[PDB]
Design an enzyme around this catalytic site. Sequence first.
Site, PDB file in Angstrom:
ATOM      1  N   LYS A 192     -64.476  86.320 -31.023  1.00 38.04           N
ATOM      2  CA  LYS A 192     -64.354  86.178 -29.317  1.00 38.04           C
ATOM      3  C   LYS A 192     -63.648  86.006 -28.612  1.00 38.04           C
ATOM      4  O   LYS A 192     -62.519  85.425 -28.475  1.00 38.04           O
ATOM      5  CB  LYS A 192     -66.171  85.938 -29.401  1.00 38.04           C
ATOM      6  CG  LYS A 192     -65.558  83.938 -29.248  1.00 38.04           C
ATOM      7  CD  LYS A 192     -66.456  83.553 -29.497  1.00 38.04           C
ATOM      8  CE  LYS A 192     -67.216  83.445 -31.166  1.00 38.04           C
ATOM      9  NZ  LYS A 192     -68.655  81.935 -31.408  1.00 38.04           N
ATOM     10  N   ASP A 242     -59.331  78.338 -31.938  1.00 38.02           N
ATOM     11  CA  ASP A 242     -60.306  77.838 -32.776  1.00 38.02           C
ATOM     12  C   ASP A 242     -60.703  78.057 -33.799  1.00 38.02           C
ATOM     13  O   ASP A 242     -61.453  78.260 -34.275  1.00 38.02           O
ATOM     14  CB  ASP A 242     -61.695  78.460 -31.979  1.00 38.02           C
ATOM     15  CG  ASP A 242     -61.792  77.773 -30.814  1.00 38.02           C
ATOM     16  OD1 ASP A 242     -60.793  77.509 -30.035  1.00 38.02           O
ATOM     17  OD2 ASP A 242     -62.840  78.104 -29.733  1.00 38.02           O
ATOM     18  N   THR A 269     -53.536  70.328 -31.662  1.00 34.92           N
ATOM     19  CA  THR A 269     -53.002  71.856 -31.118  1.00 34.92           C
ATOM     20  C   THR A 269     -52.110  72.147 -29.932  1.00 34.92           C
ATOM     21  O   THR A 269     -52.089  71.202 -29.160  1.00 34.92           O
ATOM     22  CB  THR A 269     -53.897  73.100 -31.169  1.00 34.92           C
ATOM     23  OG1 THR A 269     -54.941  73.126 -29.898  1.00 34.92           O
ATOM     24  CG2 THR A 269     -55.526  72.243 -32.323  1.00 34.92           C
ATOM     25  N   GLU A 270     -51.720  72.866 -29.797  1.00 34.45           N
ATOM     26  CA  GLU A 270     -50.938  73.125 -28.361  1.00 34.45           C
ATOM     27  C   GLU A 270     -52.243  73.672 -27.572  1.00 34.45           C
ATOM     28  O   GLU A 270     -52.860  73.928 -27.710  1.00 34.45           O
ATOM     29  CB  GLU A 270     -50.300  74.209 -28.261  1.00 34.45           C
ATOM     30  CG  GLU A 270     -50.507  76.179 -28.740  1.00 34.45           C
ATOM     31  CD  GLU A 270     -50.083  76.907 -28.277  1.00 34.45           C
ATOM     32  OE1 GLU A 270     -49.165  78.200 -29.560  1.00 34.45           O
ATOM     33  OE2 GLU A 270     -49.219  77.086 -27.391  1.00 34.45           O
ATOM     34  N   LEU A 271     -51.463  73.027 -26.497  1.00 29.76           N
ATOM     35  CA  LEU A 271     -52.734  73.021 -25.204  1.00 29.76           C
ATOM     36  C   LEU A 271     -52.448  74.322 -24.239  1.00 29.76           C
ATOM     37  O   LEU A 271     -51.584  73.997 -23.801  1.00 29.76           O
ATOM     38  CB  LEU A 271     -52.464  71.405 -24.452  1.00 29.76           C
ATOM     39  CG  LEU A 271     -53.181  71.348 -23.082  1.00 29.76           C
ATOM     40  CD1 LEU A 271     -54.272  71.040 -23.917  1.00 29.76           C
ATOM     41  CD2 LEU A 271     -52.735  70.212 -22.313  1.00 29.76           C
ATOM     42  N   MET A 272     -53.985  75.116 -24.650  1.00 25.90           N
ATOM     43  CA  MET A 272     -53.908  76.053 -23.591  1.00 25.90           C
ATOM     44  C   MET A 272     -54.634  75.926 -22.528  1.00 25.90           C
ATOM     45  O   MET A 272     -55.272  75.548 -22.649  1.00 25.90           O
ATOM     46  CB  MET A 272     -54.627  77.106 -25.068  1.00 25.90           C
ATOM     47  CG  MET A 272     -53.918  77.640 -26.509  1.00 25.90           C
ATOM     48  SD  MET A 272     -52.262  78.098 -25.991  1.00 25.90           S
ATOM     49  CE  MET A 272     -52.762  80.019 -24.850  1.00 25.90           C
TER      50      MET A 272
HETATM   51 CL   LIG Z   1     -60.433  74.346 -33.899  1.00 25.50          CL
END
Ligand SMILES: [Cl-]
Length: 273
Positions: free
Chosen positions: A143, A160, A93-96
């Site tokens: 959440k 997520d 995934t892209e890095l947050m």
């Molecule tokens: Cl995830």
Amino acid sequence: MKAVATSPSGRFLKFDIELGRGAFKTVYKGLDTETWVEVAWCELQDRKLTKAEQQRFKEEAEMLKGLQHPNIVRFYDSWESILKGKKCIVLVTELMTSGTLKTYLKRFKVMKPKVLRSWCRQILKGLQFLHTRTPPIIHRDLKCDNIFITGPTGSVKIGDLGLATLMRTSFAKSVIGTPEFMAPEMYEEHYDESVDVYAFGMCMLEMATSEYPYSECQNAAQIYRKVTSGIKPASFNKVTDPEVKEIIEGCIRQNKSERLSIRDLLNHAFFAE
Ligand SMILES: [Cl-]
């Protein structure tokens, strides 16, 4: 020579740098060796899944690659591998690195009304996107802790989504599920996308009050009793804006048939833009 892990296409490379660790999920820093952009290498494993549950896990993670929306975290790749003698899922995934709504509230104490209106609309956009995929995607685990921001005055991105699919299984739901945010019908066998509206309402409540909904409760059964008795969380009576309070009320109704839909919320005058 050190063994270095890669995606099957060889495009993504894993660093031996752990960024985060939680139940069923360990996040490592990674690299797109073709664009030279750093990414999040997420390794997921639920060692209690059946063969059919793991296969569905593999297929749901692979569908995340095709998602492209301004308010959804970007999922670049996914594949099934092995880890400690059992199958696992890797999700790139892209890095947050700019925090979440949770870390935002802890930093700035309160969220200004214009920020709440703007970011809540974007969450609804992302959920509308997920609910209109084929097949529809129910988040099940929304959440403030998994709604990432691109910056203090940026946009929000729902994340997520790999870990959230595990809410469909028994053991994982009891471990990662946040009962304050879970709609009451999630303790039944079948539920639909309205559980995401319920969780959205609790996200909006937390943003509007800067405190944890149903914090006065000690366990899930306590929360379930209050919800099924029509007892709102104590923080609900701290909402100052009557329009915001009206939207929260419509989202956290115990009966799904009476609960507001995503379309009702986006067509509400509060979210008009
Ligand atoms: Cl995830």
